Structures are given as C-alpha cells and as structure tokens.
Design a protein around this ligand. Structure first.
Ligand code: HEC
Length: 71
C-alpha cells in the first residue's frame, strides 16, 4: 500500500496536506522524532484526539516505515 498515498489521504485530514500539523501536530518529521515502531503503534492505536486504527497491517506498516524514511 502506497505509504505516502495513505498518509496523503488518511492523515492529512487532520495533520494537514504537508503534515506540518493543522488540526494535529506536525508529523512530516515524526520519523525524525520517533521510530517506525512508535509511529506504527500510534497509527494502529491513536494519540490524544486521534481516533487511531485509521490504517492497519500493510497500511500502517507502510505508513510507519515511510514516515521513518521521511525524516
Ligand atoms: C484527525 C482525526 C487525525 C487523523 C485522521 C490522524 N491523526 Fe495522527 N494525530 C492526531 C492528533 C490530534 C494527534 C495528537 C494528539 C492531540 O490530540 O493533539 C495525533 C498524533 C499523531 C502522532 C504522534 C504525534 C504527537 O503526539 O506529537 C503520529 C505519529 C500520528 N498522529 C500519525 C498519524 C498518521 C500517519 C495518520 C494516518 C494513518 C494519522 N496520524 C491520522 C489527529 C489525527
């Protein structure tokens, strides 16, 4: 699953187009701040106001890895 496409259609909804942090904090650099493990769990689980489980399996895996790679 195209990680950037996922993020660019599942996360930008709150994080904003560039993931610079609109209705949610900036995660374009979340790969710098946190590791794929952390991010993966957060995608699967949630964070604060984030519903979580927005992406799962290959979706969330691809997301987290790509996010780690975004850094
Ligand atoms: C709006 C309903 C959200 C969607 C859709 C996604 N996220 Fe999110 N995320 C959101 C918020 C508001 C927060 C922080 C808590 C708060 O209430 O302010 C987050 C947090 C994350 C984090 C951690 C960032 C941090 O806590 O500093 C990550 C790594 C993250 N979110 C990733 C992420 C991805 C990749 C999503 C799409 C699969 C996604 N989020 C959707 C709000 C929302």
């Amino acid at each position: 699953v195209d990680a950037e496409a996922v993020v660019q259609q599942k996360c930008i909804s709150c994080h904003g187009g560039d993931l610079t942090g609109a209705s949610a904090p900036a995660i374009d650099k979340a790969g710098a701040n946190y590791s794929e493990e952390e991010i993966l769990d957060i995608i699967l689980n949630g964070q604060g106001g984030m519903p979580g489980g927005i992406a799962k399996g290959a979706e969330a895996e691809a997301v987290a890895a790509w996010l780690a790679e975004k850094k």
